[PDB]
């Protein structure tokens, strides 16, 4: 008689500082090893105490969806290590467990993947596309996890203020469980841009003929942060100050 087994031993996710209350973070799932059943699994989180009556995150008991339960203003680099449990038979059966890491980021952690297909196409296939991106990042940083911040129209024009809904801006970041924070955005750029032709070939079954990533770019918000004189420090190979 065997306990529920989570599909991953370790779920990694992220939230941005501006995430709304009860925003989706990630979904967990456990099944019975012998039958594959999962229709009666009750999911619960085990989170350490948080100040001020905040609860951090909740999980939908019967769907496994983890959602935010507090705001994350100014909390870039905060991290939440907790557990999720699954108990079969609506709580009356055996239990399994997995670890969870959620890291807080902002636009200083992100890169924009620009594609020549509409955002609805990218969104529809996002699970398969994220898994491909994971593979390339994990070759450089084992165990890292790519997270999708947003999928939208391609931004362009002055200050990237115009929207082209026939193309797509896919804003991503990656969380490193060794550091409990995001991978440096310029390292993330190097990982993706350096393999852009290989990633494009892997994306072909999903983007269709003629579809490809056009470029990787840094969010416009990063330029606004430097103009305000924030997060500026030393970086390697340059005398110009770049936001951290
Ligand atoms: C809730 O929705 C987010 C995206 O909005 C997913 O990334 C997550 O896995 C869950 O399905």
Numbering used by the authors: 1144 to 1387
Tell me what the authors wrote about this structure, in their words.
We therefore expressed the EC11-EL construct as a secreted protein from mammalian cells and solved the structure at a resolution of ~1.4 Å by x-ray crystallography. As expected, the EC11 domain shows a classic cadherin fold, while the EL domain has a ferredoxin-like fold. The EC11-EL construct forms a 2-fold symmetric dimer in the crystal lattice. Unlike the linear ‘top to bottom’ arrangement of cadherin domains, the EC11 and EL domains sit ‘side-by-side’, providing extensive interactions within each protomer and throughout the dimer interface. A ‘major’ dimer interface is formed by contacts between EC11 and the EL domain of the symmetry related protomer (EL’). A ‘minor’ dimer interface is defined by contacts between EC11 on one protomer and EC11 on the second protomer (EC11’). A top-down view of the EC11-EL dimer illustrates how residues from α1b and α2b of EL form a negatively charged cavity harboring a deafness mutation, Q1347K, at the end of the α2b helix. We also note that there is a strong density in the x-ray maps with a ring-like feature located next to Ser1167, suggestive of O-linked glycosylation. We examined the fit of galactose, mannose and glucose to the density and found that mannose fit best. Although the mannose moiety does not directly interact with other residues, it fills the EC11-EL dimer cavity and may help stabilize the dimer.
Hair cells have a characteristic morphology and harbor actin-filled stereocilia ‘staircases’ in which the stereocilia are coupled by protocadherin 15 (PCDH15) molecules from one stereocilium linked with cadherin 23 (CDH23) molecules from an adjacent stereocilium. Upon movement of the stereocilia induced by fluctuations of the surrounding fluid, the PCDH15-CDH23 ‘tip links’ trigger the opening of a mechano-electrical transduction (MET) ion channel at the stereocilia tips. PCDH15 belongs to the cadherin superfamily and consists of 11 extracellular cadherin (EC) domains, an extracellular linker (EL) domain, a single transmembrane (TM) helix and a cytoplasmic domain. Here we demonstrate that PCDH15 forms a robust complex with LHFPL5 and that the assembly is composed of 2 copies of each protein, thus providing concrete evidence that the composition of PCDH15 in the tip link is a dimer.
